[PDB]
Amino acid sequence: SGFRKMAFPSGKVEGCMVQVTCGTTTLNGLWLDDVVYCPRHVICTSEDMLNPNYEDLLIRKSNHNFLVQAGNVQLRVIGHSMQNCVLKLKVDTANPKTPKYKFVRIQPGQTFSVLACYNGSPSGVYQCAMRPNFTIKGSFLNGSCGSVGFNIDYDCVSFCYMHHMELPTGVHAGTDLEGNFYGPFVDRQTAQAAGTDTTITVNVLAWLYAAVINGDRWFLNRFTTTLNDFNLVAMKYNYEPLTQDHVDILGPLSAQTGIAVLDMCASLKELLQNGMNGRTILGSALLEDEFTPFDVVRQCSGVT
Amino acid sequence: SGFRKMAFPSGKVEGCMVQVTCGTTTLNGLWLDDVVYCPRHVICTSEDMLNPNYEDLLIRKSNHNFLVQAGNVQLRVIGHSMQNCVLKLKVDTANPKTPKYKFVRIQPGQTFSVLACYNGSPSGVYQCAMRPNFTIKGSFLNGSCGSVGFNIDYDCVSFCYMHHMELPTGVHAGTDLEGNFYGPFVDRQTAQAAGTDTTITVNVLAWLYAAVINGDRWFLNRFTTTLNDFNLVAMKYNYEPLTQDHVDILGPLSAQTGIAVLDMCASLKELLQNGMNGRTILGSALLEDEFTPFDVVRQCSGVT
Ligand SMILES: Cc1c(N)cncc1NC(=O)Cc1cccc(C#N)c1
Ligand SMILES: Cc1c(N)cncc1NC(=O)Cc1cccc(C#N)c1
Numbered sequence: 114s115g116f117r118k119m120a121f122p123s124g125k126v127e128g129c130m131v132q133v134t135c136g137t138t139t140l141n142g143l144w145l146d147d148v149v150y151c152p153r154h155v156i157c158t159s160e161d162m163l164n165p166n167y168e169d170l171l172i173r174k175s176n177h178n179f180l181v182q183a184g185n186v187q188l189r190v191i192g193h194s195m196q197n198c199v200l201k202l203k204v205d206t207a208n209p210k211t212p213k214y215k216f217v218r219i220q221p222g223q224t225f226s227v228l229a230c231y232n233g234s235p236s237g238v239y240q241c242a243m244r245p246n247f248t249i250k251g252s253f254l255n256g257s258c259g260s261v262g263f264n265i266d267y268d269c270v271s272f273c274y275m276h277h278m279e280l281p282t283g284v285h286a287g288t289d290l291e292g293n294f295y296g297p298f299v300d301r302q303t304a305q306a307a308g309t310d311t312t313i314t315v316n317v318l319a320w321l322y323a324a325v326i327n328g329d330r331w332f333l334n335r336f337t338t339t340l341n342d343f344n345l346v347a348m349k350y351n352y353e354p355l356t357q358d359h360v361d362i363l364g365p366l367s368a369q370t371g372i373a374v375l376d377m378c379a380s381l382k383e384l385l386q387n388g389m390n391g392r393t394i395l396g397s398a399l400l401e402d403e404f405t406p407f408d409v410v411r412q413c414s415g416v417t
Numbered sequence: 418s419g420f421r422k423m424a425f426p427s428g429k430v431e432g433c434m435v436q437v438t439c440g441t442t443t444l445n446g447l448w449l450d451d452v453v454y455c456p457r458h459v460i461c462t463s464e465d466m467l468n469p470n471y472e473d474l475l476i477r478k479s480n481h482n483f484l485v486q487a488g489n490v491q492l493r494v495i496g497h498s499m500q501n502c503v504l505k506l507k508v509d510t511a512n513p514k515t516p517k518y519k520f521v522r523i524q525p526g527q528t529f530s531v532l533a534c535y536n537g538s539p540s541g542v543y544q545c546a547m548r549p550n551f552t553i554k555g556s557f558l559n560g561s562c563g564s565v566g567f568n569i570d571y572d573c574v575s576f577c578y579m580h581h582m583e584l585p586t587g588v589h590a591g592t593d594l595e596g597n598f599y600g601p602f603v604d605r606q607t608a609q610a611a612g613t614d615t616t617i618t619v620n621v622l623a624w625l626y627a628a629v630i631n632g633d634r635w636f637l638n639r640f641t642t643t644l645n646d647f648n649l650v651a652m653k654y655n656y657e658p659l660t661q662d663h664v665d666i667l668g669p670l671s672a673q674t675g676i677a678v679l680d681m682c683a684s685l686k687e688l689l690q691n692g693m694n695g696r697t698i699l700g701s702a703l704l705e706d707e708f709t710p711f712d713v714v715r716q717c718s719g720v721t
Contacts, residue, residue: 114587117556119541122532124428228426234721237423238542250700252421254719283418283632328587389702391692396554398693398702415558417538 116323116395118403119412120226120240121265128210131188132233133202133259134180141230141259142181142202143272143290145211149181149188149202150290151259152277153195154300162302171195176202182233183208197292198277198300212270216290219273221245222313222353224405225262227274232256242316242403243274245353246308247296248284251276262287267417280307313402314352315359318377320401322366323409324394331392333372336379343378350385362406369413420627420699422707423716424530424544425569432514435492436537437506437563438484445534445563446485446506447576447594449515453485453492453506454594455563456581457499458604466606475499480506486537487512501596502581502604516574520594523577525549526617526657528709529566531578536560546620546707547578549657550612551600552588555580566591571721584611617706618656619663622681624705626670627713628698635696637676640683647682654689666710673717 133142133151137158142151154162156170174193179202181188192203219225224242228235229252241249241262253260253276262274276287277300284307286298298305321332338346344354360374367374381400389398404412437446437455441462446455458466460474478497483506485492496507523529528546532539533556545553545566557564557580566578580591581604588611590602602609625636642650648658664678671678685704693702708716 114558114583115554115556115589117541117543117545118422119533119543119556120424122428122431122539122542123426124431124539127426127428229423229719231719231721235426235428236719236721237421237716238426239421239423241421250419252419252423252716254418254717256719279418285419388695393703396703399697399700412541412556413558415533415535415540415560417535417540 114327116327116412118240120238121263123226123228123235123238125212125265125270126228126261126263127235128212129208130228130230130233130235131181131183134182135174135178139232140256141233143259143261143275144181144183144188144204144208145214147204147207149204150199150275151202152275152288152300153198153200153292154258154277155200165301167195171200184233195292198288198294199275199290199292213268214270214272217271217273218289218291218293219243221247221295222316222405224403224408225264225273227251227262227276228260229253229257230260240403242313243295244310245313246310248280248286248307248310249274251285253279253285261290280305282307312350312352312400314347314355314381315362316402316405317352317400318355318359318363318374318381319366319406319409320395320404321377321380322363322370322372322406323404323413325370325372326413327395329394332380332384332394334380334383336383337373337376338379338382339375340378343375343382346382346385352385365410366406418631420631420716422544424542425567427530427532427539427542429516429569429574430532430565430567431539432516433512434532434534434537434539435485435487438486439478439482443536444560445537447563447565447579448485448487448492448508448512449518451508451511453508454503454579455506456579456592456604457502457504457596458562458581459504469605471499475504488537499596502592502598503579503594503596517572518574518576521575521577522593522595522597523547525551525599526620526709528707528712529568529577531555531566531580532564533557533561534564544707546617547599548588548614549617550614552584552590552611552614553578555589557583557589565594584609586611616654616656616704618651618659618685619666620706620709621656621704622659622663622667622678622685623670623710623713624699624708625681625684626667626674626676626710627708627717629674629676630717631699633698636684636688636698638684638687640687641677641680642683642686643679644682647679647686650686650689656689669714670710
């Protein structure tokens with residue numbers, strides 16, 4: 114019992130972190146096999162960030178200009194290429210600590226762990242969701258660029274995020290491991306609009322199921338609703354419309370608790386319309402949307 | 418910017434986790450140098466837990482009855498001893514992955530990371546506080562016993578907690594690494610009272626400073642208070658009385674923000690008396706007490 118915002122164990126990712134320096138800019142890199150991946154803006158000075166021509170900036174660089182240091186050990190760079198917004202530095206040594214891994218592009222609303230790093234050194238690990246507007250509400254300071262987000266399936270690390278930028282609003286933007294930004298963002302020092310965000314409805318319902326499993330049941334009521342009726346309420350409260358695909362992935366939690374998905378929707382409808390009334394659910398005074406149905410099942414069954 | 422409930426990177430601790438089996442009971446063990454530490458209740462059956470005589474139960478066990486497996490590798494047990502509520506199994510092989518470490522007994526109100534484990538395998542990492550009543554509100558299932566709590570100071574892991582028990586209330590109890598329980602608990606299947614808990618005042622003030630640093634400032638007011646006046650409010654709202662020792666450790670945050678500690682106390686006084694008014698602070702709709710002043714400074718400066 115108990116329910117926490119749990120991150121994956123970060124050990125497999127810690128073994129991959131390196132420091133990358135190009136000129137006067139230092140950030141983090143991810144060393145997997147014989148390649149180091151890092152944000153391409155490592156090649157920019159602060160002046161370059163206003164309107165960078167990355168192709169021209171990279172042409173002024175040679176392999177020997179990319180200094181890669183794995184803690185104490187120096188890597189020899191034998192190739193460099195830019196793919197979208199990431200640089201791939203080929204090194205002459207495969208990382209002996211490379212875990213089994215995949216590169217995945219996650220969907221908005223999915224969750225992942227971030228290993229925040231500075232100068233190639235891990236500082237902390239936290240769990241977060243990719244917002245529906247493709248930003249993440251992380252905890253990142255200058256030097257955190259190159260820190261990665263990931264999920265783990267037994268012994269396989271699926272890397273899904275590389276940190277690039279903090280928007281003027283204090284929220285964060287980054288790319289998949291092929292260097293494609295999540296959302297409309299570009300790697301430039303220009304104010305950029307993140308879309309209107311919404312609350313991840315299926316995750317709030319998953320978390321209400323986690324609450325019932327752990328004994329927090331006060332919000333359960335005598336009501337039911339329909340997808341159409343619930344979606345009128347979701348619209349009013351800026352929640353994602355619930356679909357049958359979301360109801361389908363909530364099936365295991367509905368089966369475990371015996372609470373039909375639309376009956377849990379009626380509890381969520383009442384909480385949106387009435388608020389919490391000064392009460393808490395799983396130690397929170399607001400509706401939590403950073404746990405997917407898969408996370409709730411994993412945490413409630415003890416998967417390693 | 419951004420502020421998250423961040424855990425320490427768990428890699429150094431993952432390398433120490435092993436599975437310990439004695440008879441039909443399996444739990445987690447911590448392998449440091451040539452010793453494996455685990456809860457002594459690994460020697461009990463479910464029937465034994467009602468009123469165990471651990472000395473007599475341990476006398477029926479030999480070194481060869483303790484099966485220790487480090488993932489895939491089997492450890493040879495060459496000695497066993499009970500120290501308070503932990504067993505120490507001497508093995509013939511020093512853990513090659515032993516980090517620099519210390520055993521510390523933390524104070525109530527301090528925070529630490531927990532690496533939740535099952536069958537010797539890490540499942541997740543989360544940050545929590547030791548409550549003033551010496552319980553922790555963790556996320557633990559059957560088989561999680563032996564999971565540890567820790568802090569990290571550069572390359573040194575300070576182990577402070579080993580998980581032993583879930584109280585009938587769903588909160589958690591455990592020991593330091595010398596096997597002494599935190600709080601009044603005993604390792605027996607008997608209902609046990611955890612003391613009245615309080616809110617960790619110095620941590621709420623540290624978190625209000627973290628909020629101002631990150632731009633959440635709506636709660637700042639034109640008022641000030643005294644320690645005596647603030648403590649009358651703390652008493653009414655079940656908060657720990659604030660002392661000059663707490664004001665002293667808040668000095669770096671007061672200096673960074675220019676907000677005198679007693680002026681922040683007046684903001685906290687107004688929030689206790691008026692509530693949040695439907696607003697949030699750092700994404701929370703309640704007053705958060707799981708960040709110490711040291712955690713806020715570490716997170717706000719990027720320490721690795
Ligand atoms: C300063 C900072 C913080 N606090 C957190 N995270 C990141 C940063 N760094 C930056 O955003 C620096 C920067 C500037 C312009 C474009 C890009 C890109 N791509 C990157
Ligand atoms: C079942 C469980 C969960 N959910 C989380 N954490 C732990 C458990 N295990 C137990 O509490 C089993 C137990 C029983 C009686 C005394 C002691 C001790 N010491 C340990």
